[model samples]
Target: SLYKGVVEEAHNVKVIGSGEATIVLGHGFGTDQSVWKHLVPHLVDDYRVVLYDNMGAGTTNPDYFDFDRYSNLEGYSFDLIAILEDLKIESCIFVGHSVSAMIGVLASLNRPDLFSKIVMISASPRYVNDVDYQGGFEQEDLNQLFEAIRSNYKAWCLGFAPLAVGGDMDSIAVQEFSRTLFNMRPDIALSVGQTIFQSDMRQILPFVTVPCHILQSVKDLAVPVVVSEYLHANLGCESVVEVIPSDGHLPQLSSPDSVIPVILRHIRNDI
Candidate 1:
């Protein structure tokens, strides 16, 4: 296990209102915990939150990223589990965006008692194509996409950022996602994307026993609505998948009004 540098915790954040739940927000590629800035205020009153950045992104010490260790999402799950263990937190609702959706799955699979339920926002268990499974992106298409990232990372990042926000999306929400999406080094972004997209978690979905609630934007280019349904179908425990209205991949960022209520109502237990 690597020592994740200075996990700057947010203060003045309420853990829960009189009858709320404890919550943790896991961000996706090229983003840090701050991505949840918009939803934090609404949550503090009714839920306790744990917002953190992975070692490779955000305010972390980039030098500490063990390339070998960080090669896959397991490394991310490793750090996530460690943080919760350190805080002695158990049974909190795990809300993850993008790739962190799977990271949350892996983490909870490893420690079932640590989490109560997972709110997978714009998440998927896989992103590439396979026999009897349709993930939208073909294997070679993904390869070429990675190659494009390898050759011109910045242009690639800039290119996809806007698409994730539903394009021509001249709005503060899309602009914010683009800014956060552009924060990473090109190489890191490419590697992260490939790792996540290439992963096939069909074998392990059965191991997940905690309840899972999946939410997907209607027109996200990055996360297909099908994968969201696929997760609900494959997840080993009781799960529910919902189709919501939003074109943005990051709902907390682009459509908090729609996403927050679904999360607080379903994912939060003992409500």
Candidate 2:
């Protein structure tokens, strides 16, 4: 067994409900586990829900973040495995958002038996456009984004929150995202952002054998609809794509009513 107390404390892991089956929820960049607040209530009665913050999350201690260790998604994957082992979880249904979606994929590859199924929300293998592929942003756009974060992190959050959450400035989802995005230290935010945006995990898709449920918003600024189709085409396992009739990279928070049922149907093995 791993160091359960220390690992759990580090990630602020919380296991709720008493159901036999476990469901682990992994949040994406710029948000923490609280992003699942809207869906947790719907899950707790029927499943044991596990929620935790990633290493760079605002709620986690900054001192614990190692620049070299977390430079790639592998480090996060290692953490996920550790969290599961620490909790003695033999298998789980993984629901990962945005970057965490890929993080779960990496973890599933490392420990195939650990995840019974993986639900990817707004997932992308690469964020930059390449030959014959449209992953969304261009290299120049990403560079400019990094510069904007470095120049003024708070201002960038102000502008990015609305766009990412697909809501107005005064909307609750945008406000929540803005608060979490602003909570991170500027340097950590910039580093984590760069790591996620620059990552190219396309080659690893074919190696992933665990079944995947690809969930995306009908319109997402970060992940275009075509990327989901690309994932369906490239992934080695049986994977299905379901575009939520919603906008934003975070439909679970912005439109839980629509997203929750889809998540339930997938996790309950309906599809």
Candidate 3:
């Protein structure tokens, strides 16, 4: 039962590559560990690669998902910390996409010893625009987004998929987004989405001391360039913002050639 509980808690942990340094890749909103499949090969040879499903976001044990706890970003941060502690992982380079980027921020804040550095792919501190701050959405826009999900999540996913993936509707990236979006329970999806878009961490960005590399796309629908620039300016620690020369929210999937090199540069300290 101890083994079973560990597996459940970690949600199908997988480790590849053998090296002194470890790299942990966390998923975004709707996808699972599979989201990193394209980028794994490049990393596995040089670094110990760790991947896991974010409890509610991946095809995890739905029964173990605490809707109330996961309704906040802090809950997800605790989950990440627990996984690292349970695996006895000492220090790692944390790579997170979208909301998971902020999740990494929270986790590093909680346990600075657990992370050597963090790579935030398409991250945002806030989604709704503040006065003179551009988070790429208005409060009214988010209200409409959540309301649509509440009324009909499936329909919302169908329409939102293209925008999130930032490509032709029939593109592989968009289809993958649609698949993951459909895999979630509508209610849980709404809760997780709400936590991601509505939450703001601008005040706490200055508290973090872990070095960060922001892997932002040149053109992304969900996160604007200014947000990544903002992260670079406000992050309390040393950071680099490398704008991936691609267009999409999931550049690792849509444009791995460009995404991989930037990540590698960071891991190698080439940048």
Candidate 4:
């Protein structure tokens, strides 16, 4: 019974490497734990690395995905904390991509002792633009995105993959993104997209005391560079923004060479 209810199993958790300190990697929407494949290899040799699939990820059991619980980002934050608790991680470095970055921030706020430093990649606290803030999306644009997903999920994936990956249509990065996006159930994809695009957590930025290393691609379709500056300005704790010389929201996947070294520098700072 205990094993059946374990959070590790529910999230398909895996721990690798023989180092003392731990680094937990969280992927963004559409993609699963595999998205971190490029980064994990470099980390495992120097630090213990923990990886897990977010609920509703293709690798995770769909039966356990509760739409109501995951309707907001906090639900996902609870899951992150639960996984860390299950692993008995007193404190660790958190590397989160996209929405997962905010999830880690929320988790750090809930359990400040659980996180020593957070590395955020291509992250955004809000996606919809406001009068004073630029989140890079209009309400109408998001509404059109939802409609496209509803009408033809596969076609939408094809159209979105190139834009989101910021790569040539025939490039490996675009194909990889398309594969993961296609892997998701249409309903789950639409629901998650709507939640991520419409959600706002700017108010909570001031409460995140954990130090952060914010990495932003030079050009990201999902998160504008200015958002990284906004995070640097608003975060309660010390933070630095590094504009990665890369394209696309998933730079770690498309441009790992540029990202891995920066990540290594930050991880070494833990020493």
Candidate 5:
């Protein structure tokens, strides 16, 4: 493990090097920078790594996520932009999983030149279904999940987050993530779920001008086949889609080994 000149504060994003070529890693919801642990050791020595927690989840800056601010994903997206500037990082490959996959697109929307490429793993631009668009879930279905969050939050966490992450549901990491998911105040989880599954970024994909690669699982509920296909189509540049044989959204945990080669090949090209 490479050393950080700065202290590695818990829940704070970690930067591993001072190299010019950087690969910034941003996580999805309910997990922290640690989720990237399996992949980081491989790249830290060669690339300047960037990682951080969103305002709401994990060990964040303790700003007590403003319910109003994070009502949408914009606030977390802005933090991503700010971190790049703070580190004076010019051009880098943004590796985002799940929600951050879309977050990367929004950030690229603001500063196109800042990103050399993007490796979006298990990303879904939209989750709620439309007339022709299938995001894998319906508003009413999500509302019921949210209602469970409000009534018996623990039950949802213990009950749902696991199934959503996909197979290998009984693993230690899945159980751990479930505990955190259950503990989140019911309203927050409900509202955030509403935001994630409901928000649409179809318009934003056209703004992406970088080389985008889609890393989808053989099975993923949060992001259906159409969602990733839409990204490969709408993005304004060359994009490739690689399907890893895994289930659900938490590829990092469900089959971290399966994600290894997929991530390494992209990181090599990205840098």
Candidate 6:
């Protein structure tokens, strides 16, 4: 059994609430499980909430992180699968933010039995633009992004936080995002950032069979509305797409009121 105390510690897994159904919440890149703070209150009273940090980010035990394994999304998927297996959770509703959204998609594909539904909040299958796809970034743009991160992650965070957080720069939401970014190990952050930006999941979109809900922002700088349409168009499953009337990539943090109700509706199959 992989139920050793050390295993859960590696991912910073924490289970809260005592409701019958489980809801596993995975945070996005450059952040930890604390990203779920604003959304948790609405969920806890009616569901069991499982929160965990991705292996390479946040305060996860570094020794457990394998660069080769995590260089692709599969590693993150396996970690999520392991967490559910260790906890003996039969099935759960997955709520994943940004990169974690695709991670949940991969994990659901890997172990369909572990997930009943999925909510991808501000998720993108590909970050790079292709010949016929508008993924928002060109290869050169991503290269410069990584280079900027390498040159100075701190400076990148300071500059990127406002844009990514998007609703209000001076507000606590942007500050919270910046706090998570500053706390990460810069080297690891760069590596994971590269992994997230460089990897493509369009090929696997057709394999997703579970009920998938895409929560997109109306004016997200990072993921264009076309990307959400692309996802909805290609997904080989029951899919629901909603463009929340908000700005920015991290809408759950910046606009939880708009984000939470959609999630609740999706979870209850009311959408």
Top-TM-score structure, candidate number: 2
User: What's the TM-score of each model vs. the native?
Assistant: 0.89, 0.97, 0.94, 0.96, 0.91, 0.96
Runs of candidate 1 exceeding 4 Å displacement: 1-20, 269-271
Model 1 TM-score? 0.89
Candidate closer to the true structure by TM-score (higher is better), 4 or 6: 4
Which candidate tops lDDT?
2
Candidate 5 lDDT for residue 68: 77
Model 6, position 237: C-alpha lDDT score = 87
lDDT of each: 0.75, 0.92, 0.85, 0.89, 0.77, 0.87
How do the candidates rank by lDDT, highest first?
2, 4, 6, 3, 5, 1
After superposing candidate 5 on the true structure, give the runs of residues whose Cα lies further than 4 Å from its correct spot: 1-11, 61-63
Between prediction 3 and prediction 4, the one with superior lDDT is: 4
Ranking of all candidate structures by their TM-score, best first: 2, 4, 6, 3, 5, 1
Per-residue accuracy of model 4 over 1-271 as CA lDDT, tens digit each: 1211679888989999968899999999989898888888888888889999899877777778899889998889899988887888899999999999999998898889999999999999999999999999999999999999999999999999999999677889889889999998889998889888989999999988899999889899989899999999999999988898888988888888887798778777842
RMSD of 5: 4.3
Per residue, candidate 2 scores C-alpha lDDT tens digits across 1-271 of: 4311399999999999878899999999999999999889988999999999999999999999989889999999999999999888999999999999999999998899999899999999999999999999999999989999989989999999999999565889999999999999899999999999999999999999899999999899999999999999999988999988899998989888888898778888735
Q: On a 0 to 100 scale, what is the lDDT of residue 90 in model 1?
A: 69
* Residue-by-residue lDDT tens digits, candidate 3, 1-271: 1111674344788878988899999888878888887889888888898898888764876778887778778888888888787778999999998888999999898888999899889899998999879999998998999999999888999899888888577888888888888899887887778888899999999999899998888899889899989999999988988888888888888777777787778777822
Per-candidate total of colliding backbone pairs: 3, 0, 0, 0, 1, 0
Q: How close is each model in CA RMSD to the real structure?
A: 3.0, 1.5, 2.4, 2.1, 4.3, 1.7
Winner on lDDT between 2 and 3 is 2
Could you tell me how far off, in angstroms, the CA of residue 156 lies in candidate 2 after the best superposition?
0.6
**Winner on lDDT (3 vs 5):** 3
